[PDB]
Amino acid sequence: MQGHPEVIDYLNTLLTGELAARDQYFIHSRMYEDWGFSKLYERLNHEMEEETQHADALLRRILLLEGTPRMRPDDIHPGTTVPEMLEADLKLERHVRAALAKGIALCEQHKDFVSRDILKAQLADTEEDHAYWLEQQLGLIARMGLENYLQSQI
Amino acid sequence: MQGHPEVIDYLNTLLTGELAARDQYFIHSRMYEDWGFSKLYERLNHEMEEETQHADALLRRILLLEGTPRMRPDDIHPGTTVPEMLEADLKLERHVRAALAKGIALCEQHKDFVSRDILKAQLADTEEDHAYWLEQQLGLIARMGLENYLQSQI
Amino acid sequence: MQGHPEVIDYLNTLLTGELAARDQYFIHSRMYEDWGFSKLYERLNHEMEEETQHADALLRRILLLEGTPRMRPDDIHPGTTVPEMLEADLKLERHVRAALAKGIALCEQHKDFVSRDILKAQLADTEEDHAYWLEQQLGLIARMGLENYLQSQI
Amino acid sequence: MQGHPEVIDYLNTLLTGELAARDQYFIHSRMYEDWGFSKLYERLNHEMEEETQHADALLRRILLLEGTPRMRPDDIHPGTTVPEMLEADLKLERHVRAALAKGIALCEQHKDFVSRDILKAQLADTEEDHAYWLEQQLGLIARMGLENYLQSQI
Amino acid sequence: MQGHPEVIDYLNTLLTGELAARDQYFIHSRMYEDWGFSKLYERLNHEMEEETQHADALLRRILLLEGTPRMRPDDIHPGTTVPEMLEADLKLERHVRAALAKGIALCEQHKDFVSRDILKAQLADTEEDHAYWLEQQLGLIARMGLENYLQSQI
Amino acid sequence: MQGHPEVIDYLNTLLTGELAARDQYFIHSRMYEDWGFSKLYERLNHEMEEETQHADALLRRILLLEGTPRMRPDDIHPGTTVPEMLEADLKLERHVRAALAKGIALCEQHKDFVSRDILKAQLADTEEDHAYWLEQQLGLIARMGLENYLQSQI
């Protein structure tokens, strides 16, 4: 079934963004492990798998709609310290959140309700799981201090 | 069996107080979880269930005594930080403690010994479980500092 | 992430309504049990738990959106006989249904699609589970008579 | 193997009748459930599955005999109340019974003994299971009254 | 709860379409089995069950909304060869897809968000399961030839 | 119990025909295995066992009726290639089908209803299992070509 060219293009924009999110969590999780923070490694490794699934859902939907997926990831922007890395992932998730919301609006306008639902599932993941967890870590650092927070992530 | 109107009225006062305790633990537990303190969430979520059972015991006893339960909760007074929330719950439990003790005295005076025993069970919970645990947390903050205490509640 | 103030306010209106639904089922279920209708007790006790979960979902979403939840329940309006209690719960659910539908429209307008989905889940529960079951009981009373219906709920 | 054109045509008449029986039980069972009579729902849902199997046996036999099955169901005639629905299903089963008996006679005449046996299996189901159960329900309503009968089907 | 007459009417249009889809898969699956293609039989038998569930969801929703379901299936249009049957089912699913999308738009307009969600679930099934699988089979025939494809479906 | 001499004689005719069917499947199944088509071997080996049981039922019935069974099999007519062997077994089953139908008519005429039922069971096996499967194989060869069909039977 041929999708609407505007929806396919916009799914392709989301796809290169999810491929990038996957890669930024790839490097941050391994950096965390390199420093001995295994709890941060585990969480961001898990989030890398989750972004791979988000990318996979977009890719498959684009193929079903007879589009050609764009496989070049967006640039990533890794941090160099634990607070910079948390902030960099939160900025990325906020960008994804905004992009998914605009995508849902576009899908509704072009009456592509299944693509809309696929983006809504990812939006809920972005807001209630990925971004929220990051806001919490930054909040924890603010409440107990960075040293105590890092101790808790060994 | 018709209870004494003074006992029924006083059980109704305790009931609106327990409905309020339930609700104050509802909001504090979720605030704790919002900030990433899952151990505080778990404990206050558990205490919300316990106040619901205390409310339930009062409600059922009022119905057995052919009274009409008053279902409007007392106002709650949530805190805005972990130490304010602990202090606010301790103040509420101290109020409940005093109210239950006065109720036991009233039940004894009106020779309603089963209602007295129901309040005694709740009084033991209030003093030895709910209030004591709160005093302990505040004591811990005083002994290791707030930052260390918060770290321990992640 | 800061939610839209209009959405947060409206979620807060829904929250005080769910806290009230929870409490009206609290008292009706116990009244049913007081009279010996254990099947009505079981169903409304189950519905009290369900409204507590609906309230919980709203409360958590409001906190995620950086709002302050309003914990005062709306007034309840319990019945005094089995048909009045069924009618009173149906009137409450119809009110909730209308309020949730208006909320979904508001969330769509402010492009808060995750809050919309949370309300849609609750709307489906309200229409297809809570309100429908009540309409059925009233329908049963109409078809076999109140005496037979009450016999069936022992 | 080419069947006798008269037998194939007559199997096709039975087939559109079974497709209709399936559909009339589809709607009646769901109407019963809509009203809260789950025991009537369960029985007629089960009978819908049974008519689907009766239809399936006829359809497959028609294909084996190199005919073309007629898939348009006969008109159905649902009732609007429990006694009308029982009467409407009994009238349909009595019609099926008569049609199957005439079919068995036709198959015997054209020496199609396997098609005869397939109709005999369905005739036994129609008389001893479907129609009999309906006659029993109507008999029960007559003996204990409609209100008591409906109570028993919740 | 009385639904909007325009939504009820449109659900009734979808219902007669699902009853038809169920019946077209009924006959095609049995034709496939008659020819010895058991893998096609299994898949279309499974899809017949799925359309029966789609019909059932619509029927129940119409009853909940106090409408009267229309139980006459749309005409079906079975093929006479494996490629015609695949094409005929794909044409039917494309028609259903378009009809469901228009229905979702109508439900949104009349603020019937639960009926909208029921259609969205069916739309996802239609696009991502039923229609996609058909497009794949036709694609396979194009890539390996009809003879090889038929061999693979024994 | 002495059977009718005409029925006994006719059962004896069917018996020598079943002994022959058993033997023709004996040789064809082993020829299929000799060539490496193990799926054809398995099916015709299974059908040899089934004809042995059909023969056994006739033999025992003849003895019960105090007749003397005729144990000389009819001549068989094996094919020399897979399509000739399928055609030769289909011709044999069509002959058996016709002979069983005439036998059922004869049994009905002589009011030997148990012998009739024994032949009806075998007739259903002949039409719906043995002959149908053969027609299907020949149909498959016609649809995918003989080479592909043979590949599928390895």
Added chain:
Amino acid sequence: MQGHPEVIDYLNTLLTGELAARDQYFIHSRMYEDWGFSKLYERLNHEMEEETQHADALLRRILLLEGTPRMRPDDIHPGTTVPEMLEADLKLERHVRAALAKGIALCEQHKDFVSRDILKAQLADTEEDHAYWLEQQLGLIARMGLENYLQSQI
């Protein structure tokens, strides 16, 4: 421990190549599934996981050696048909093979024997698993024809 800058740079070149291999298998596997070749989907999905592990081993080794991993994947070059996709993956694996062999030589020269061993493990995977399997598929297409080969991958 600081690695040799020339080795770190060369590991970084291999890393962007493995990230690309991972992505080319990502898209090809999903394209294969889109067309209904589930065996090709399964194999290339498995190879995507394997390249992710190869990338992960390089990334971690670069961090251990105190380098900064380069996370931008090389360009990929997906095919548009099954033979083009197989050829495109074989060309990529041949490039990886050559790059790994040059890397092993470089590591030996700089006496980084553990990095050498990590590349040797990946080289064995590339030659004996990934590239060999691709050569086999192309060989199969050449021996039985593309149509038969595609049939075998459903």
